[PDB]
Amino acid sequence: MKDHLIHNVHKEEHAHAHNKDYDIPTTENLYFQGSSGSSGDMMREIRKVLGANNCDYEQRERFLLFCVHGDGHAENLVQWEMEVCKLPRLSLNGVRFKRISGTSIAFKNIASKIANELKLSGPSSG
């Protein structure tokens, strides 16, 4: 069971709401929205961002990739896993950012960027 044939199905919808009214918990996890097709593309696209930001990743599970950023040393280094999943409630591939190690500051400052590239929501701390 190997995908030998290519498949490019892009969709474009103009139905959404522009409002800043969300309820985020106090836990240590960030949320984002902005799928680029199917749960698969997510992996491909996402990874693309890392490579661009001199960031490496270690695939663990079919829908699990160990993302990591490296600038110069640990202080700047940051490890986080990105799992791709979809729920009926939100009905939108919810990409959760789990900080395995490193620092919050860098963990966020970088989390905000990745989103920009993946045309993801891009939530901030207000």
Swiss-Prot record:
Residues 62-111 form the KA1 domain. It comes from the Eukaryota. It is found in: Cell membrane; Cell projection, Dendrite; Cytoplasm. Interacts with MAPT/TAU. Interacts with DLG5 (via coiled-coil domain). Interacts with STK3/MST2 and STK4/MST1 in the presence of DLG5. Interacts with YWHAB, YWHAG, YWHAQ and YWHAZ. Interacts with PKP2 (via N-terminus). Interacts with CDC25C. Interacts with KSR1. Belongs to the protein kinase superfamily. CAMK Ser/Thr protein kinase family. SNF1 subfamily. Serine/threonine-protein kinase. Involved in the specific phosphorylation of microtubule-associated proteins for MAP2 and MAP4. Phosphorylates the microtubule-associated protein MAPT/TAU. Phosphorylates CDC25C on 'Ser-216'. Regulates localization and activity of some histone deacetylases by mediating phosphorylation of HDAC7, promoting subsequent interaction between HDAC7 and 14-3-3 and export from the nucleus. Regulates localization and activity of MITF by mediating its phosphorylation, promoting subsequent interaction between MITF and 14-3-3 and retention in the cytosol. This is MAP/microtubule affinity-regulating kinase 3. It comes from Mus musculus. The lineage of its organism: Eukaryota, Metazoa, Chordata, Craniata, Vertebrata.
